[PDB]
């Protein structure tokens, strides 16, 4: 069984991985290093060998160019790689397919040859019961990527050709998502990339970009190395500066994902023709407005979107009502808002037409707004550990989890919990050593 959790994910996350020890740590060598001008990770690795040669007026081409550091080894740093390591990607990926109109995605990755996203977004998408997914990863040049086409070939991927610089090849054409990972793969240039791509973006699609905010510790860190390659410090920018240039291009941000460290994950949506949207309170407890909604959606002729908001209870059910709307016929103009408040001293906001907040969710035009202790945010699914939870017990006994086979014995716990010491015949017992015996054997190792 794939066995998941259903919690409330805001759609600003900032300091997401301040959790994790073993980031901290990679961060504090890569400063030390940095610091007047040590561990097994690339990139500590590549800043003290650029540190090594020179302790001052360091080459940029000895720096740029040394062993172990040639290979697209970057990626793998924890430090750079690690929101892809993290449920972010999964919550961003989750929001772009369920704002889809269909139940086929269409994805279309730039720069799969640095981005090698192509190995962890089909995974990702695994656990959808009927979503169909079309991948397809493309690349400035050829021989880039000609690498791993058994990776490439063990999932469903689709090569291409396209360099972001020139406008997108009609092949790849209107797309449901596209993914860049700017990160470690080179952008050309801001400008002229975002406006290629959004010109490739199908309408009411998403494009999701990963990249390292400038003016942040490791954005400067990274920044004085590679100083060599133009191209490279031409994607890391500022976070304001980031904001600024995608408006330019007309795309909006619905979502971002922000690392302690620096680190950000953007998740931009194409702006769609508008229309006049209809609302309707969900919130009598009569039911009466089943029949308002089924006037509504009877006449699949008009094209005006339905926003289904409720305001007045917090229990109300409009999430599941809307995800079960939508696969009905003319639901692709459902959409809903609902204030679910867990604190009764948290503020309920306004959601009066005029209220800026409405106006914020419409341009934002998502299916799902959940309103919960000042965020806004849907509800959405995450792959649990696997690790089986312990505990501290007095109680507990010696089973073999799996029959036959002895590596699976441990410890559980035992319902020896609940006893009563009154009892005479109950006697309960501490124990000390316990024996083992032919019998013992043979039922262990089944």
């Known amino acids: 069984p794939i066995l998941e959790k259903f919690c409330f ?3 600003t996350e900032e300091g997401c991985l301040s959790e994790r020890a073993a980031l901290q740590e990679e961060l504090q060598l ?24 020179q302790l001052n007026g360091n080459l940029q081409l000895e720096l740029a160019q040394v062993l172990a550091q040639e290979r697209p080894k970057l990626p793998e740093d924890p430090l750079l790689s690690g929101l892809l390591d993290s449920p972010a990607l999964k919550a961003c990926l989750d929001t772009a397919v369920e704002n889809m109109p269909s139940l086929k995605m269409k994805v279309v990755e730039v720069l799969a040859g640095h981005g090698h996203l192509y190995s962890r977004i089909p995974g990702l998408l695994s656990p959808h019961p009927l979503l169909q997914l079309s991948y397809t990863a493309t690349d400035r040049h050829p021989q880039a990527l000609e690498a791993a086409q058994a990776e490439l070939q063990q999932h469903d991927v689709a090569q291409g050709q396209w360099d972001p610089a020139d406008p997108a090849p009609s ?27 959004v010109a490739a973006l199908r309408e009411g699609g998403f494009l999701l970009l990963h990249t390292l905010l400038r003016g942040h510790p490791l954005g400067d860190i990274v920044a004085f190395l590679t100083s060599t390659e133009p191209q490279y410090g031409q994607g890391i920018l500022s976070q304001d500066a980031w904001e600024s240039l995608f408006s330019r291009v007309s795309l909006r941000l619905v979502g971002l994902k922000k690392s302690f460290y620096g680190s950000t994950l953007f998740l931009c949506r194409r702006p769609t023709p508008q229309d006049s949207p209809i609302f309707l309170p969900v919130d009598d407890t009569s039911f009466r407005w089943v029949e308002s909604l089924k006037g509504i959606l009877a006449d699949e002729d008009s094209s005006r979107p339905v926003w289904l908001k409720a305001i007045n209870c917090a229990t109300s059910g409009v999430v599941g009502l809307v995800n079960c709307l939508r696969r009905e016929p003319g639901g692709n103009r459902l959409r809903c808002v609902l204030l679910s408040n867990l604190s009764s001293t948290s503020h309920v906001p306004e959601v009066d037409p005029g209220s800026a907040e409405l106006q914020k969710v419409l341009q934002g035009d998502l299916v799902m707004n959940v309103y919960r202790d000042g965020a806004w945010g849907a509800f959405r699914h995450f792959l649990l550990e696997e690790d089986k939870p312990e505990e501290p017990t007095a109680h507990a006994f010696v089973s073999t989890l799996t029959r036959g086979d002895l590596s699976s014995i441990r410890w559980v716990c035992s319902s020896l919990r609940h006893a009563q010491p009154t009892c005479p015949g109950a006697q309960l017992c501490t124990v ?15």
């Open 9 to 11: 994910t805001p759609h």
């Open 30 to 53: 890569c400063k030390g290093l940095v610091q007047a001008l040590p561990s097994q990770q690339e990139l500590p690795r590549l800043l003290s060998a650029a540190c090594r040669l």
């Open 171 to 197: 092949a790849l054409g209107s797309a449901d998502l596209l993914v860049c990972n700017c990160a470690v793969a080179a952008l050309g240039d801001p400008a002229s990339a975002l406006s290629n791509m």
């Open 432 to 446: 000390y050593y316990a024996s083992l015996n032919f019998r013992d054997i043979m039922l262990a190792t089944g």
